[PDB]
């Protein structure tokens, strides 16, 4: 459709993620989200398809080309299935991200080969119970002590929670100096007084394990700090222009899986004597959801462009998700009504896309969070 | 907030549906959701209360007052369990109605008391696998046979498909006639022949039994034909009214109750140094919601006025139903993004609110066909 425009690379990388996602994303979607369960086996083989290491070189054993390509890869598994969407996004841009961008050698060397393979996932533990927009107001509690950072406190809504081998966490070290008194923490999952909570109940995405984990106690070696004490708040934010590129391609991913099966049953359903796509008002709302699919699309690919050559690009990052985001709940929600009554069945699958949508207004910087970021740098 | 608009018994007949709503729907409304199932004695005690007779005359044995009534009543059950809003409004429009409408005197004898307090729950059967909206292009026969009508066909959604003792069935009786070809029918769903299936698996209204049944040879008495023969169009079309005026309250209930669990969670819940009421964003959604509910109670109400001194309101019905369906939707949406990530969460309810609400835009004829009715009516 808009292939000319992309590089034989790219056409490559979108055209391995989409047969992987057509054999073994789309099929098993329905029971994934039945099941609230991600099998190990897909994780594992999203890792071995080299799409867990999209932001990390290729010398550090990644699979990093450029964000275009991400955000195609992107948009591709999200077709088959929004919960290995968010589990990609996640891992990708704030589980490598934040190594890559601020661990020592040591730490690089450790994890990050581990981790763009997925062998490795990743959390990243900011949001909690108290503090999600405003993130800087932080109560879990990071102190030296004996040669240890000692972490108490709790995180809510930790993608990747059971299944992640290691934890980005941010706690405060150094109450009086504020937001630049927390720092960031490498926490292999496996700690003592690492305890992760039952997967939320959700709406949507519901095989992404979404987990309260509390911290008693949990004590790691000194050198399991990430950068510098008090770069906490820089840190947690230096990989914002990735995950929102990410979630905004994961909105438009679901978005057009929708519409694809909206189209293909308003061809083969006949009502008043025609298929239901010649009708007037089907046509419209086909087209409408055309335009914003296509319109989300290349916002993403713009971010994208930016990113890949080092521009700034947070406003545009944050343009692209926004707009993906809140066009997905209304191109899902069309896709529901041109199946009539069939849209509400869960047989129809248009219905989970609605359901899994819906959450891309809110993670990742709700929308409000978006303008305001999008209007401050006007 | 309206009630000097409304007379003594229409406000006690409203109080005394929210107590009931408080008291034994919203508390479990939940717990229904989850296994998919209504319990028999809440059925029963909607019946006791008078909520199953709302549209029959009282000297028949019904509670008929005014549509008013009817829709205070449905707006606070819809918001204590939308699937309870369902079962009501279905059995009192056209499971009652079409007997009210057309039933001989022997036939209003063996079912009106019985519907109207309950004790015998009505379906209403028109809807099949090829035929939702354009509800005239019947394929279900109906042949005079030994002194028995004998049915066969396939009926898809029928609403109370397993707990309905009685069905008003449609179907074609003399093919060469086309639309004045379909013939009613009172089937005791205890008849031989008569195959309900296992209830539709649904995103929302989960708790409202929604079946395909299937009729094999299903034999019936010859004076269970409702009304004359050719009739069957206009009977099902007989009750569109009260069946649309019970759908865009259910709309409104719904809506209405999410926005109560988000202007609460707005006063409690602290962000940025205040309670997020207080943030403008958040005010302007509360003020958005508060705006659109009131419309549409006021659009609804104006059709029940109308519908109360017997005068012409299938477009204003109309209107009601599709303003209260499409705002129900947005009103829910913005009650889930005021909680944030809670509002994603199984345990806030408002993403139940969320899935409920959408149905209400595609049955009791979709937005498109309310739109063909209003604009054809000017
Ligand atoms: C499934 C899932 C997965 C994840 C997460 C959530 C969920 C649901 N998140 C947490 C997520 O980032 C978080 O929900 C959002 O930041 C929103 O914060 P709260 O949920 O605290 O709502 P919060 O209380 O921040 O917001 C409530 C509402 O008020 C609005 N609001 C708040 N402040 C405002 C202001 N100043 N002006 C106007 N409006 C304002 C918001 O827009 C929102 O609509 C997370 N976190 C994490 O650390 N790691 C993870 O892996 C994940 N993943
Ligand atoms: C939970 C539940 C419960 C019930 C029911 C459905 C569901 C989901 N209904 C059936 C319901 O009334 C039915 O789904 C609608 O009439 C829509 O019809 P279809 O599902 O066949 O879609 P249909 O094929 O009619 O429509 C598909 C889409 O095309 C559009 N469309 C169709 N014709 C068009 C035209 N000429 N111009 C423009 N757009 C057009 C529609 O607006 C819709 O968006 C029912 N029925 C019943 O008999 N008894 C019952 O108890 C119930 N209850």
């Not at 190990?40 to 450029?66: C, F, H, K, N, R």
């Not at 998700?321 to 709940?329: G, H, I, R, T, V």
């Not at 896709?335 to 069945?345: F, V």
């Amino acid at each position: 459709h808009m292939d000319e425009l992309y590089t034989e690379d790219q056409r490559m990388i979108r055209d391995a993620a989409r047969a992987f996602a057509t054999e073994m994303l789309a099929p098993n979607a329905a029971q994934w989200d039945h099941d609230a369960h991600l099998p190990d086996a897909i994780v594992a083989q999203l890792g071995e398809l080299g799409l867990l290491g999209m932001i990390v070189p290729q010398e550090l054993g990644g699979s990093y080309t450029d964000y275009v390509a991400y955000a195609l890869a992107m948009e591709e598994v999200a077709a088959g299935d929004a919960a290995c969407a968010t589990m990609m996004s996640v891992h990708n841009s704030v589980g490598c991200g934040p190594i890559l961008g601020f661990g020592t050698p040591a730490q690089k060397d450790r994890w990050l080969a581990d981790m763009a393979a997925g062998r490795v996932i990743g959390a990243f533990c900011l949001t909690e119970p108290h503090a999600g927009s405003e993130a800087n107001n932080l109560r879990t509690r990071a102190e030296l002590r004996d040669g240890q950072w000692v972490l108490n406190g709790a995180k809510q809504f930790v993608t990747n929670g059971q299944r992640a081998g290691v934890a980005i966490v941010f706690a405060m070290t150094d109450p009086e100096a504020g937001k630049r008194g927390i720092s960031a923490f490498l926490v292999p999952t496996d700690t003592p007084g690492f305890i992760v909570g039952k997967p939320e109940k959700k709406m949507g995405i519901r095989a992404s394990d979404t987990c309260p984990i509390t911290f008693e106690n949990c004590a790691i070696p000194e050198d399991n700090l990430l950068g510098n004490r008090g770069e906490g708040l820089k840190i947690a934010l230096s990989n914002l222009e990735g995950g929102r590129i990410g979630i905004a391609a994961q909105a438009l991913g679901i978005a057009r899986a929708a519409f694809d099966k909206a189209r293909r049953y308003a061809g083969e359903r006949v009502q008043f004597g025609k298929p239901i796509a010649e009708h007037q008002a089907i046509q419209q709302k086909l087209a409408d959801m055309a335009v914003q699919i296509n319109a989300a699309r290349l916002l993403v690919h713009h971010a994208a462009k930016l990113r890949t050559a080092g521009l700034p690009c947070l406003s545009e990052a944050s343009q692209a998700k926004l707009f993906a985001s809140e066009m997905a709940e209304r191109v899902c929600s069309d896709a529901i009504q041109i199946h009539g009554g069939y849209g509400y069945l869960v047989d129809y699958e248009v219905e989970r896309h609605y359901r899994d949508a819906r959450i891309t207004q809110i993670y990742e910087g709700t929308s409000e969070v978006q303008r305001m970021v999008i209007a401050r740098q006007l």
